[PDB]
Write a protein that holds these residues in place. Structure first.
Motif, mmCIF file in Angstrom:
data_model
loop_
_atom_site.group_PDB
_atom_site.id
_atom_site.type_symbol
_atom_site.label_atom_id
_atom_site.label_comp_id
_atom_site.label_asym_id
_atom_site.label_seq_id
_atom_site.Cartn_x
_atom_site.Cartn_y
_atom_site.Cartn_z
ATOM 1 N N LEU A 221 36.523 34.048 31.264
ATOM 2 C CA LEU A 221 36.700 35.255 32.042
ATOM 3 C C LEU A 221 38.001 36.014 31.704
ATOM 4 O O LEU A 221 39.085 35.429 31.753
ATOM 5 C CB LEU A 221 36.637 34.927 33.560
ATOM 6 C CG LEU A 221 36.276 36.111 34.457
ATOM 7 C CD1 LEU A 221 34.741 36.347 34.437
ATOM 8 C CD2 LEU A 221 36.851 35.942 35.888
ATOM 9 N N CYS B 154 34.289 41.892 40.163
ATOM 10 C CA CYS B 154 35.599 41.395 40.573
ATOM 11 C C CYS B 154 36.627 41.809 39.509
ATOM 12 O O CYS B 154 37.458 41.000 39.137
ATOM 13 C CB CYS B 154 35.551 39.860 40.769
ATOM 14 S SG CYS B 154 34.473 39.328 42.190
ATOM 15 N N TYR C 125 41.839 33.994 45.290
ATOM 16 C CA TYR C 125 40.684 34.239 46.196
ATOM 17 C C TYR C 125 41.202 34.523 47.630
ATOM 18 O O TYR C 125 40.726 33.948 48.607
ATOM 19 C CB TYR C 125 39.749 33.016 46.205
ATOM 20 C CG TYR C 125 38.901 32.839 44.955
ATOM 21 C CD1 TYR C 125 39.000 33.736 43.872
ATOM 22 C CD2 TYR C 125 37.998 31.781 44.858
ATOM 23 C CE1 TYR C 125 38.207 33.575 42.721
ATOM 24 C CE2 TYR C 125 37.202 31.606 43.730
ATOM 25 C CZ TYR C 125 37.315 32.483 42.661
ATOM 26 O OH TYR C 125 36.515 32.311 41.544
ATOM 27 N N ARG D 62 32.313 30.120 37.161
ATOM 28 C CA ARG D 62 31.691 31.441 37.336
ATOM 29 C C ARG D 62 31.101 32.004 36.024
ATOM 30 O O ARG D 62 30.001 32.542 35.994
ATOM 31 C CB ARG D 62 32.716 32.443 37.891
ATOM 32 C CG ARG D 62 32.196 33.897 37.932
ATOM 33 C CD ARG D 62 33.285 34.945 38.309
ATOM 34 N NE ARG D 62 32.706 36.275 38.557
ATOM 35 C CZ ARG D 62 32.174 36.691 39.724
ATOM 36 N NH1 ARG D 62 32.151 35.890 40.805
ATOM 37 N NH2 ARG D 62 31.667 37.926 39.816
HETATM 38 C C1 699 Z 1 45.995 37.010 40.837
HETATM 39 C C2 699 Z 1 44.725 37.702 41.254
HETATM 40 C C3 699 Z 1 43.633 37.329 40.238
HETATM 41 C C4 699 Z 1 44.363 37.257 42.693
HETATM 42 C C5 699 Z 1 43.322 38.117 43.504
HETATM 43 C C6 699 Z 1 43.184 37.587 44.963
HETATM 44 O O1 699 Z 1 41.949 37.610 45.373
HETATM 45 O O2 699 Z 1 44.091 37.389 45.733
HETATM 46 C C7 699 Z 1 43.502 39.674 43.528
HETATM 47 C C8 699 Z 1 42.672 40.205 42.383
HETATM 48 C C9 699 Z 1 42.350 41.691 42.379
HETATM 49 O O3 699 Z 1 42.993 42.466 43.053
HETATM 50 O O4 699 Z 1 41.545 42.021 41.349
HETATM 51 C C10 699 Z 1 41.431 39.344 42.410
HETATM 52 C C11 699 Z 1 40.343 39.890 43.299
HETATM 53 C C12 699 Z 1 40.383 39.975 44.711
HETATM 54 C C13 699 Z 1 39.165 40.579 45.146
HETATM 55 C C14 699 Z 1 38.299 40.928 44.169
HETATM 56 S S1 699 Z 1 38.915 40.545 42.627
HETATM 57 N N1 699 Z 1 41.978 38.020 42.808
HETATM 58 C C15 699 Z 1 41.353 36.828 42.543
HETATM 59 O O5 699 Z 1 41.816 35.744 43.008
HETATM 60 C C16 699 Z 1 40.062 36.777 41.749
HETATM 61 C C17 699 Z 1 40.080 36.478 40.368
HETATM 62 C C18 699 Z 1 38.852 36.388 39.682
HETATM 63 C C19 699 Z 1 37.613 36.588 40.363
HETATM 64 C C20 699 Z 1 36.294 36.430 39.626
HETATM 65 F F1 699 Z 1 36.133 37.424 38.702
HETATM 66 F F2 699 Z 1 36.435 35.229 39.027
HETATM 67 F F3 699 Z 1 35.356 36.346 40.591
HETATM 68 C C21 699 Z 1 37.606 36.853 41.761
HETATM 69 C C22 699 Z 1 38.821 36.935 42.435
#
Ligand code: 699
Ligand code: 699
Length: 557
Positions: free
Chosen positions: A379, A361, A443, A195
């Motif tokens: 990131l 994000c 994700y 990314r």
């Molecule tokens: C341990 C967390 C990193 C996991 C969590 C999840 O989706 O279940 C929840 C996170 C959040 O609440 O910010 C993040 C996101 C979920 C949805 C948008 S960003 N999450 C991510 O997995 C995530 C990390 C990083 C990114 C990026 F920035 F790489 F696109 C997108 C999504």
């Protein structure tokens, strides 16, 4: 049309709810300012209800229909398969909410005759009835934050038997269609490294880059019946089995477009006419609808050479700057188009000419240096929320270990390395639980992961250089340091001292434990070892980690 209508029955909890940070003997070593950490509870559901409840108007123009035609042309090249009951059962998280009908997440995963017969009969009903709305449960999420207090978010989900059926009809569709449709703009196909690489290579492919993030206010509430029928028309372009076409039509009419809301006690809360946040298509639906509105809005705005990056409701655009005054004016037109499309901004968008100042994000590009002194982009994010949740998880076992997901997603960062790794490895060592598999989410999908496997995971996802980054940016250092003062977390100099100890403690035990010592905590010694590829890394199955998002989707990987 109104996103929701309410009866005035309350959104109720289904278990004891804590709002106040639980303290144990380990808390103070991480975080002193306890009163700044809280969890949301159903007590604030009323406030959330008011935020998410509004009238949506939509005005659809030729740019909109033009982008939709294109999206549809690409969707038509996709061939998707129905999953068997068995395949759909194995995608169910072991700890998924049990059915109202006398079986749970383990009965599903075991293919118990009762789980399977119910699934078959729910499937059958989907084929026979494309009209009757399917029940959903509405709940207030317990999530941990640092103050400055948010109201609980709301989750809306159908019964387990329904969720299995959703996987059957749609898993392959939601996993494969959005990258075909959106190509390199589909965000969930990339690991965090990929990314950053995509964003840098996009920023660089512009003569004079300009970028911006776009935050829609309560995106799920802005999703209209039109939008959800349009998502259905995109799915239906795929080359599908006729039975799958029928189940998809059915789930759309009876579940996706709307339905009754029931609380944990069985009372009717009201009715939904917007996106359900706890269905399989939540992520795919939000990505497509966000990409469709935003692409059409770029055309209305006349942005030059646009490259979008979309992850559900999260949107980044990078384009050719027309000049600073022209760029600001263009964003205003974009926002106007977005809004006509029913997706008004929370915060108005701001043009950026510095890639590191775009947050999407909740995350941003930054730079540090490898062992060789070379520039590396990676990131990162503000660590306040990750640290708030680590404190909570320090004192309580929770269903999802955000400390572990954060270590995996943000391994290269100064804050994940120095604090998260150091703290949780110490805790794990003291309990001899290094080998104990833990649930986290990445994700939106659920993963069961042994801490002892972290080194090979990080290497695969981020490469070796994640174990030797240094010379972080002043901006990144200042943001981390400022966050530690706010939460009353010990300064980085303390963490280095602790990590030497934790490192020394791990090297002893040899095997995988020593590998964590050597790789995870090499930054903590004055004379660094050399880090060479770990053998068991390419032996691990990681493809399938970054294919699609499944936020709310009840997916176990
Ligand atoms: C341990 C967390 C990193 C996991 C969590 C999840 O989706 O279940 C929840 C996170 C959040 O609440 O910010 C993040 C996101 C979920 C949805 C948008 S960003 N999450 C991510 O997995 C995530 C990390 C990083 C990114 C990026 F920035 F790489 F696109 C997108 C999504
Ligand atoms: C301003 C200092 C905080 C910067 C310094 C530097 O040489 O780059 C000096 C540090 C040192 O004393 O070990 C450290 C490292 C440099 C090389 C390896 S670790 N440095 C770091 O920047 C650093 C601190 C912390 C981490 C961590 F823990 F996140 F891995 C990695 C790197």
């Amino acid at each position: 049309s109104m996103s929701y209508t309410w009866t005035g029955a309350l959104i109720t909890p289904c278990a004891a709810e804590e709002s106040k940070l639980p303290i144990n003997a380990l808390s103070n070593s991480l975080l002193r300012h306890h009163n700044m950490v809280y969890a949301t509870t159903s007590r604030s559901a009323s406030l959330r209800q008011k935020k998410v409840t509004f009238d949506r108007l939509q005005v659809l123009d030729d740019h909109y229909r033009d982008v939709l035609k294109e999206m549809k042309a690409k969707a038509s090249t996709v061939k998707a398969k129905l999953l068997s009951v068995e395949e759909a059962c194995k995608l169910t998280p072991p700890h998924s909410a049990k059915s109202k009908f006398g079986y749970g997440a383990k009965d599903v995963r075991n293919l118990s005759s009762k789980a399977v017969n119910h699934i078959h009969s729910v499937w059958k009903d989907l084929l026979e009835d494309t009209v009757t709305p399917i029940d959903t449960t509405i709940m207030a999420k317990n999530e941990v934050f640092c103050v400055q207090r948010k109201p609980a978010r709301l989750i809306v989900f159908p019964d387990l038997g329904v969720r299995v059926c959703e996987k059957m009809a749609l898993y392959d569709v939601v996993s494969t269609l959005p990258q075909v449709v959106m190509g390199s703009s589909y965000g969930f196909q990339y690991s965090p490294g990929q990314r950053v690489e995509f964003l840098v290579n996009t920023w660089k492919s512009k003569k004079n880059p300009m970028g911006f993030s776009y935050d829609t206010r309560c995106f799920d509430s802005t999703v209209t019946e039109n939008d959800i029928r349009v998502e259905e028309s995109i799915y239906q372009c795929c080359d599908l089995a006729p039975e799958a076409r029928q189940a998809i039509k059915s789930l759309t009419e009876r579940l996706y477009i709307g339905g009754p809301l029931t609380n944990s006690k069985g009372q009717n809360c009201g009715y939904r006419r917007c996106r359900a946040s706890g269905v399989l298509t939540t992520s795919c639906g939000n990505t497509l609808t966000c990409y469709l509105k935003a692409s059409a809005a770029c055309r209305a705005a006349k942005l030059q050479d646009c490259t979008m990056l979309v992850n559900g409701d999260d949107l980044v655009v990078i384009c050719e700057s027309a000049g600073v005054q022209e760029d600001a004016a263009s964003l205003r037109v974009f926002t106007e188009a977005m809004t006509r499309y029913s997706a008004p901004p929370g915060d108005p968008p701001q043009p950026e000419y510095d890639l590191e100042l775009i947050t999407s994000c909740s995350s941003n590009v930054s730079v540090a240096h490898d062992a060789s002194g070379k520039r590396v982009y990676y990131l990162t994010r503000d660590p306040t929320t990750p640290l708030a949740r680590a404190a909570w998880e320090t004192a309580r076992h929770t269903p999802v270990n955000s400390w572990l997901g954060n270590i995996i997603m943000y391994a290269p960062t100064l804050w994940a390395r120095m604090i998260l790794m150091t703290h949780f490895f110490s805790i794990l060592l003291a309990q001899e639980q290094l080998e104990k598999a833990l649930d986290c989410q990445i994700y939106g999908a659920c993963y069961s992961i042994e801490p002892l496997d972290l080194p090979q995971i990080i290497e695969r996802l981020h490469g070796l250089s994640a174990f030797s980054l240094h010379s972080y940016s002043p901006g990144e250092i200042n943001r981390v340091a400022s966050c530690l003062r706010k939460l009353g977390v010990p300064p980085l100099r303390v963490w280095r001292h602790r990590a030497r100890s934790v490192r020394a403690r791990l090297l002893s035990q040899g095997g995988r434990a020593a590998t964590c010592g050597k790789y995870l905590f090499n930054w903590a010694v004055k004379t660094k070892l050399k880090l060479t590829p770990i053998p068991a890394a390419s032996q691990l199955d990681l493809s399938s980690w970054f294919v699609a998002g499944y936020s709310g989707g009840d997916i176990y990987h």
